[PDB]
Design a protein around this ligand. Structure first.
Ligand code: U10
Ligand code: FAD
Ligand code: HEC
Ligand code: HEC
Ligand code: HEC
Ligand code: F3S
Lengths: 136, 540, 413
């Protein structure tokens, strides 16, 4: 459970969003460990770098750690949380749909297709501004 | 088994076959409906699409949610299964998707139910190009209305959109209001000189046929979760409730003809390649514009060496479609695609005109599918983190615009559907193979259409413009068993009955003598109902 | 509208005497599914040959308030003539004038009702009427209460005949006045407790919520379906606001009748913050025609989660109701939840139609089996509704067959 907690804190730092599902995170950690056998060590190294250099957000960590070998792991974590997939094939396992983090920035206007916005004619309203990040 | 006798046997439980079976069982006949594919559940396909990878959602994968069975495979183009082989200069324009099962390819479709213009039924007589239908628009109008009422088609009831198909009755429902993207596109192209008008859709703007009103799930392709749109499985279910027998996983492969060239029986396989024999008084093939000519050519006899109903050598030829030109860009102002159905409006200004004697009539349209998957994938591909990632996702979801321009191809005898000599499926049946060319008609129409698409992008202030350099398929297959009055120049007659065999009807889109300008499945349904009338007349 | 027309709308007499949407109204032919069989409502239009055109005022009053036809044969108690037994003479004559004047005649005989022995003879119904104690002195105002309470009681008991469905029947299929408005099982549906009990009845409902439900059938905690949807759509939505207010006033004074095993109100069940697993569904890809999807959470997500959200709280604008805090999923008796899944919802109020598709064997959208329906209902009860309720496939099969067979119907075997 210590590894799961480490993964969840690293994910909350990398994505910048605290409200991350713990079952999705557990499945993601299981799949990452099944893919990379040194994933836990890389998580520990990333967290050690963050806690040692005192990076305020993921932007500072990304800018100051572009050339290090840990950057692909950070990018892969961000992409797995945002997209719900880890591999890049057409039969890859989907771990998060409608709770994936790329459907959230425009969720207040745009539909996540197989789930309904409010009501059979909701679209007759005017949409919100693009310059207003909703929530999460 | 070994008898499976019925008054009428239909081969293929698609929209045409199921509608025909329902009409026949409503009128006292006994119907046996066979389908090569399996039975499918709407909720299982919904789950399969939801668990389909986001890259297969961004790029329109409409076949992965439907599993392909080895005995009756259908086409999949994320990674290509090579079921339908395509050759020719415009092979990329014929890589179109089909689904095999009880319900057919209408399981996934935008449900755009269109009526052809009267001049589309006399194309050669009006413009000197293509061929004429065996029947006029006035003869199909009652069946058009019957199909629209059975399927529940929305329409712009009180509106002078453009010179279009004249109606005797209003649509069963009125078109639901536009989303933001459709309103913005309509205004922009109206300022550009184009008439953006509502698309008649087999959708529910109100509860209809015991099915819910459309809540804008925006997943009409490849699956509606709630049933607020028409699928041919509805007709199959209604026919089966009335006593029709439906046999899934029944790959018809052989036909027997007597001394009068009348089909006496058919033979169909099964997932374990056991042959079953079906005898009936009338045989109908409602499979596809691809599967019907394939079965006709596969079932060649000693009386019919070149194929069933192939005395004119025209079976499999004259393959038609609507060659499209896709285009994507980032609008200057937000468009917010996603409100409503996936295809809510279209530019029907160029459907007809005197130019149709030189180059093809076109249909320009905007895709209303949500851009959240594409925006998320693109923003992830740029290696953005933190707030910039979210800002990019929101901006590209608000600004991503997809445009298409579909053209009309003429019936060319060299666009064939010969059986492949190299590839076979698990039952040893050869794969379909189409050699496709688009013609100077569509090439000139496409030059003008590319100019128009660039004009649309410029009017919207588009950025990152990506126009496909090749023609794209549009999934509604027309031609293969052409209709006409001369037995030596056509496969089926005015009533969709083969000229060779009086016991066989072809209730398929392969019979249509012209592809037209817009989607062609409502015409197929109307023709199937016309063939139903003919079949009822023969057996009563 | 006319006084007789208003009384006919309030009495909802044009809903069972009209064969559905078609069947020109008051011509009869509607098949009420009684426990013994099918009873066909007769012709009511003032036709002198096939209708009741030759009915005098006395004969019409006898038919309405005592269940006796013009020829003297007893009427089956599919007529609420026990409820109509206490209508005032003025109301009866107003209804007679409405029938003989307002509605055009229809000359088409209705199907003859044929019931199995010993219910075939409509002469033992006199013994049934004597045993049921339905008479029946005309209604007079109880001066100890105000006028609104008296009008509400007249509407509930005499005109709108709520107790026809919300009061349980005894062994002889007669009203059980001891359990007044305590809920009953009517065919495949169940009319809940609508007494002033806070936890079992509608005592905890706000006055505005009750008024809105009776006027439209739509409330944040309760949506009308089954026979209630038709009652509201045909009769209650046309009543004046004064009538609905009087009905609410009388309903607030109905003595409480408690259920066995009740702790909180049916609309006060919170939702458990739990749901399905997206990852576990990856194994079920390439598995068309779901039969390996035996998980209740996965089945709810595939079939139900599009409209009611994955957390079961419905749409934001309220078109799709929240299954959390719902009087149907929150009931200890899961009869109405099973009935909703099997048959869907359909309610046209103010010319606007709710429709939930059906998910039974005859469904067009997604035909489910008894086991799948039971699994989905169990998931809904455990996560969104009453956690003490349970659904089995046999219960769903029983609801499909028209509910449990009454003991008296054993005589027809
Ligand atoms: C001397 O010896 C004897 C006796 O004495 C001892 C006797 O007495 C007798 C004889 C005894 C008898 C004949 C007794 C007879 C008794 C009765 C018939 C009385 C029965 C009374 C009831 C059951 C009352 C309760 C029911 C009522 C009032 C129903 C009234 C009907 C309506 C107003 C319509 C209801 C609508 C229904 C059911 C439709 C529901 C809808 C759906 C399922 C469709 C799907 C749903 C939706 C889409 C949701 C939305 C809804 C809508 C659109 C005998 C033999 C005897 O020997
Ligand atoms: C993504 C997509 C979008 C579309 N959008 C639109 C649109 O917007 N508007 C429109 O009008 N049309 C549209 N279409 C086309 C239309 O929806 C249908 O796909 C097509 O018209 C169905 O034709 P059909 O009924 O003749 O046969 P299909 O439904 O294609 O097939 C019928 C049946 O034949 C069976 N079959 C085949 N061979 C055999 C055999 N040998 N033995 C037994 N059974 C056999 C199959 O199993 C299948 O179930 C779209 C199609 C696709 C793929
Ligand atoms: C006449 C005056 C009334 C009044 C005040 C009520 N009813 Fe009924 N009712 C019926 C059914 C089948 C239901 C269940 C609803 C469902 O299946 O979705 C109901 C429900 C109600 C409620 C809601 C209670 C709740 O907890 O859900 C209320 C307040 C209510 N009713 C009041 C059936 C019928 C009838 C069929 C014969 C008739 C008549 C009535 N109801 C009449 C009334
Ligand atoms: C998956 C099988 C389900 C389940 C278990 C339920 N629904 Fe729905 N539902 C829909 C609408 C429009 C209504 C109410 C009427 C309206 O307000 O017009 C409902 C109602 C229900 C209830 C009853 C609620 C009440 O308080 O009576 C229940 C128990 C219920 N549903 C369960 C709409 C839809 C759908 C349309 C898109 C779909 C799909 C479902 N519901 C699916 C389900
Ligand atoms: C749907 C339930 C129902 C309602 C509500 C109802 N009726 Fe009927 N009615 C019946 C049935 C069923 C019968 C016949 C059964 C019998 O023979 O016992 C009947 C019989 C009658 C008869 C006897 C005529 C004959 O030919 O049998 C009259 C008169 C009548 N109803 C009038 C009315 C009036 C007036 C109302 C108030 C508007 C009303 N009914 C409300 C169902 C209903
Ligand atoms: S998916 Fe269905 S709900 Fe409407 S937008 Fe398409 S018909």
């Amino acid at each position: 459970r210590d590894s799961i907690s480490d993964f969840m804190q690293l994910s909350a730092f990398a994505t910048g969003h605290k409200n991350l599902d713990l079952n999705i995170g557990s499945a993601l950690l299981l799949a990452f460990e099944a893919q990379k056998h040194d994933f836990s060590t890389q998580i520990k190294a990333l967290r050690e770098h963050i806690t040692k250099n005192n990076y305020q957000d993921v932007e500072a960590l990304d800018a100051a750690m572009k050339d290090d070998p840990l950057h692909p792991t950070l990018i892969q974590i961000i992409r797995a949380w945002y997209s719900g997939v880890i591999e890049d094939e057409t039969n890859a396992k989907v771990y998060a749909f409608e709770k994936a983090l790329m459907y959230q920035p425009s969720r207040d206007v745009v539909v996540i297709p197989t789930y309904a916005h409010n009501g059979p004619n909701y679209w007759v309203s005017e949409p919100a501004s693009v310059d207003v990040m909703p929530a999460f | 088994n070994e008898t499976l006798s019925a008054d009428v046997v239909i081969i293929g439980a698609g929209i045409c076959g199921s509608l025909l079976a329902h009409k026949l069982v409503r009128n006292g006949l006994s119907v046996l409906l066979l389908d090569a594919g399996p039975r499918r559940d709407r909720s299982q396909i919904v789950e399969n699409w939801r668990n389909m990878p986001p890259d297969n959602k961004s790029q329109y994968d409409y076949a992965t949610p439907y599993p392909s069975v080895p005995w009756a495979p259908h086409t999949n183009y994320f990674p290509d299964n090579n079921y339908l082989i395509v050759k020719g200069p415009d092979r990329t324009a014929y890589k179109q998707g089909i689904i095999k099962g009880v319900g057919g390819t209408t399981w996934h479709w935008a449900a755009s139910s269109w009526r052809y213009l009267p001049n589309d039924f006399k194309l050669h007589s009006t413009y000197g190009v293509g061929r004429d239908y065996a029947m006029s628009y006035d003869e199909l109008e009652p069946y058009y209305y019957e199909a629209e009422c059975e399927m529940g088609v929305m329409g712009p009831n009180g509106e002078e959109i453009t010179p279009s198909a004249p109606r005797q009755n209003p649509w069963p429902m009125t078109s639901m209001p536009y989303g933001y993207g459709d309103r913005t596109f309509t205004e922009i192209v109206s300022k550009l000189g184009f008439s953006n008008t509502p698309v008649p859709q087999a959708r529910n703007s109100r509860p209809y046929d015991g099915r819910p009103q459309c809540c804008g799930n925006n997943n009409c392709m490849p699956i509606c979760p709630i049933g607020a749109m028409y699928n041919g499985v509805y007709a199959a279910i209604k026919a089966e409730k009335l006593g029709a027998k439906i046999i899934p996983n029944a790959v018809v492969y052989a036909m027997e003809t007597d001394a009068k060239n009348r089909i006496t029986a058919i033979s169909f396989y099964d997932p374990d390649k056991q042959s079953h024999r079906v005898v009936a008084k009338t045989f109908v093939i409602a499979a596809n514009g691809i599967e019907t000519p394939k079965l006709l050519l596969l079932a060649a006899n000693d009386r019919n060496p070149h194929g069933i109903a192939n005395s004119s050598d025209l079976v499999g030829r004259n393959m038609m479609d609507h060659p499209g030109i896709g285009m994507s860009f980032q609008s200057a102002e937000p468009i917010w695609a996603g409100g409503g159905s996936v295809q809510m409006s279209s530019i029907t200004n160029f459907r007809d005109g005197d130019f149709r004697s030189e180059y093809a009539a076109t249909q320009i349209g905007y895709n209303n599918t949500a851009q959240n998957s594409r925006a998320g994938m693109k923003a992830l591909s740029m290696g953005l983190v933190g707030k910039k990632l979210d800002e990019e996702i929101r901006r590209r979801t608000a600004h991503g615009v997809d445009i298409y321009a579909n053209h009309e191809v003429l019936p060319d005898p060299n666009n064939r559907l010969v059986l492949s000599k190299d590839y076979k499926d698990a039952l040893g049946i050869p794969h379909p193979e189409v050699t496709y060319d688009v013609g100077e008609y569509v090439r000139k129409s496409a030059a003008i259409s590319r100019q128009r698409l660039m004009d649309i992008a410029k009017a919207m202030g588009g950025t990152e413009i990506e126009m496909t350099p090749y023609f794209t398929p549009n999934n509604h297959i027309t031609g293969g068993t052409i209709m006409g009055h001369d037995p030596r120049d056509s496969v089926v007659d005015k009533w969709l009955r083969t000229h060779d065999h009086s016991n066989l009807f072809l209730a398929t889109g392969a019979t249509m003598a012209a592809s037209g300008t817009v989607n062609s499945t409502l015409t197929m349904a109307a023709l199937s109902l016309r063939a139903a009338d003919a079949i009822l007349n023969d057996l009563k | 509208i006319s006084r007789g027309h208003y009384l006919a709308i309030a009495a909802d007499c044009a809903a069972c005497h009209t064969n559905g949407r078609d069947g020109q109204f008051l011509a009869g032919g509607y098949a009420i599914s009684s426990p013994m069989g099918n009873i066909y409502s007769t012709n009511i239009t003032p036709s002198k040959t096939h209708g009741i055109g030759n009915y005098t005022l006395e004969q019409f009053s006898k038919a309405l308030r005592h269940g006796i036809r013009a020829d003297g044969a007893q009427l089956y108690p599919a007529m609420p003539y026990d409820a109509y037994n206490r209508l005032t003479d003025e109301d009866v004559k107003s209804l007679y004038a409405y029938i003989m004047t307002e509605v055009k005649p229809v000359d088409a005989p209705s199907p003859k009702t044929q019931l199995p022995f010993p219910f075939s003879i409509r002469a033992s119904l006199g013994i049934w009427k004597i045993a049921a104690r339905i008479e029946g002195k005309p209604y007079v105002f109880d001066h100890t209460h105000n006028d609104d309470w008296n009008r509400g009681r007249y509407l509930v008991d005499e005109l709108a005949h709520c107790g026809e469905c919300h009061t349980p029947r005894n062994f002889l299929l007669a009203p059980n006045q001891s359990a007044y408005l305590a809920g009953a099982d009517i065919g495949s549906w169940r009319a809940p407790n609508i007494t002033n009990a806070p936890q079992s009845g509608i005592g905890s409902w706000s006055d505005q919520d009750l008024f809105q439900y009776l006027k439209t059938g739509k409330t944040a905690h309760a949506r009308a379906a089954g026979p209630m949807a038709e009652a509201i759509e045909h009769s209650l939505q046309y009543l004046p606001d004064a009538d609905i207010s009087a009905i609410v006033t009388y309903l607030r004074s109905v003595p409480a009748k408690a259920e066995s095993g009740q702790t909180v109100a049916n609309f006060e069940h919170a939702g458990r913050p739990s749901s399905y697993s997206v990852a576990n569904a990856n194994s079920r890809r390439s598995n068309s025609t779901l039969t390996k999807t035996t998980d209740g959470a996965a089945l709810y997500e595939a079939v139900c989660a599009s409209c009611h959200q994955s957390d079961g709280k419905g749409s934001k604008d309220g078109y799709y109701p929240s299954l959390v805090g719902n009087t149907t999923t929150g009931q200890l008796n899961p009869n109405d939840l099973i009935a909703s899944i099997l048959y869907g919802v359909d309610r046209t109020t103010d010319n606007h139609e709710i429709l939930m598709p059906a998910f039974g064997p005859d469904s067009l959208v997604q035909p489910l089996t008894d086991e799948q329906i039971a699994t989905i209902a169990d998931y809904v009860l455990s996560h969104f509704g009453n956690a003490q309720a349970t659904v089995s496939a046999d219960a769903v099969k029983q609801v499909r067959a028209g509910g449990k067979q009454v003991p008296l119907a054993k005589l027809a075997s």
